[PDB]
Amino acid sequence: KTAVDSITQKKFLCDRTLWRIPFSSNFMSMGALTDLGQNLLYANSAHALD
C-alpha cells in the first residue's frame, strides 16, 4: 500500500546465437541457393554493399 511511483524497464538477452538475416525475398529458407541468390545470376549485375 506504500508502493513508490515506478517505471518499467524491458530488455532481452539472447546468448549463443548469430543474428541471421537471410538473403531471401520472403525471409524464409526454401533452399540453400536462395531465390535472390539466383536472381543475381540472372541479372548479371555487380552491386556494392553499404
Next chain:
Amino acid sequence: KTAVDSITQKKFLCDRTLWRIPFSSNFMSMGALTDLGQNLLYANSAHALD
C-alpha cells in the same frame, strides 16, 4: 521393534485430466467417429440417458 498396530490407507491423485469414457464398443479409439456413433440404434432413434 516397538511399532504400533496399523492400517493401510490407499488412494490416488490424478491431476490435470478428464475421466474419459469413450462411446465405443471396445473402449478403444479406432477412429473419431466411433462404431457406436454409427450404430443404427443410436443413429435412427431417440433414446433417453440417465
Next chain:
Amino acid sequence: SKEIPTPYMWSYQPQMGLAAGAAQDYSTRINYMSAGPHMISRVNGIRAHRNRILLEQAAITTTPRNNLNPRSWPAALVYQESPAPTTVVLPRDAQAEVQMTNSGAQLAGGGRPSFTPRQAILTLQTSSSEPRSGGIGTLQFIEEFVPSVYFNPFSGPPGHYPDQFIPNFDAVKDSADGYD
C-alpha cells in the same frame, strides 16, 4: 388392411444421409368410425387411389435397386455437383516484372500493366478429385424413398419380409442392432 394398406413412410437421417426406417402413415389417417357404407366406401376408394399414386410415383422417381435403403449409394447414382470450370485471368506477367525490377524500376500498386501486352488466362477444374459416394442428400431422399405401399404384409416367407423398414436393422449383418 391387406388389400388397401397404409403406406410405410420413410424416416430420413440427415447425418448418415440414409433412411432411418419406415413406419406406417398413422398420422395422416382419416377417421370413418362414425361413417356409414355411403361414406366408408368412398374413403376406402381414396385410400386405394392414394396407393395407386404412390406406386406410380415410385415407378417414375425411385431408382431401381435390389436392397431397399442401401447403406452405400454408388457415385454414379448420387447427384453430384458438376460446375463450370473456373476461368482465372492472371493479373501480372511474372517474368516481365522481374526484368523491370532488375533494371531498377520500383513497381507498386495494382492491359493491367502499361509495360506488358501479355495476358495469361488459366482454366481450372472446379469439381472434386473423386466422385462422392455413400449417402444421398435431402433432395435425393425425396426422389427415392417414396412411401412403400406394402400389399399383403408379412405373408411371404421370412427373409423376404422387409427388415429395412426397421430402424435397427443392419443389412450387412442381418441382425437388429443393440445398445453395445
